[PDB]
Symmetry: C2
Subunit: 137 residues, 2 copies
């Protein structure tokens, strides 16, 4: 058996590791019910300028990406995206949400919104920390 180290992206190799791990997790822990949850912010010509990317699985919303366009900052837009995601997650029957960040301004936004820190690590090479937060419904 050969153990091969690589530093390049490879879709087929990554799939060949992900698929059996997913199958293993299904067999052991039951259905994940993984379902995407995105909110796009779109201008007059339907272009995506920002939004939220996440998903619900195993009763929890994970927010993966959130971007607010420069022109729309300081205007409750990030909280609006979080509120739209939470509303949809509650509809799907979720028990809570989680989120992570290295940005102190995003961290403040999430905390004001109602997330509570669950752990952190750092520093990163650039001096920031990663913080994980949850919000139980």
């Amino acid at each position: 058996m050969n153990f091969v180290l690589s530093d390049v992206a490879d879709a087929e190799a990554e799939k060949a590791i992900r698929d059996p791990l997913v199958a293993y997790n299904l067999a052991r822990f039951g259905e994940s019910d993984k379902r995407d949850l995105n909110i796009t912010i779109r201008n007059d010509d339907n272009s995506v300028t920002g939004g939220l990317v996440g998903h619900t699985a195993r009763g929890w919303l994970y927010v993966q990406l959130l971007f607010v366009p420069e022109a729309m900052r300081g205007q409750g837009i990030a909280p609006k995206l979080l509120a739209m995601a939470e509303e949809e997650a509650r509809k799907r029957g979720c028990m809570g949400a989680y989120i992570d960040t290295m940005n102190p301004d995003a961290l403040r936004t999430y905390e004001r919104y109602g997330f509570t820190k669950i752990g952190s690590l750092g520093p990163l090479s650039s001096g920031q920390s990663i913080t994980w937060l949850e919000k139980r419904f």
Copy 2:
């Protein structure tokens, strides 16, 4: 400005949110130096049967996926994959590694290896918890 909720995967929409967030993070927090780190376990005909998928960024190794084939379990293979990843991460000048799991047997493996819990949440709908762990070099 239109806020559009969706529950289907969309590469172009997700890219249109990820790219400016990456550009924002570069401008504010400097270079990430994101670099893939994979280890494939390959049989005699070069097929991937398992391995580790991760990356290094901002001084830290993140292990995203780890799968050991059924025939190779209870044989120090998951620790071997972690050791190969750590060796490469140290070479790249990383300060530490982090990892997460909902599998109590994977959690035990990671703890024995030398990871230490940084936080957790749960329960999930299926009854398990998510645990995050770190290992500082």
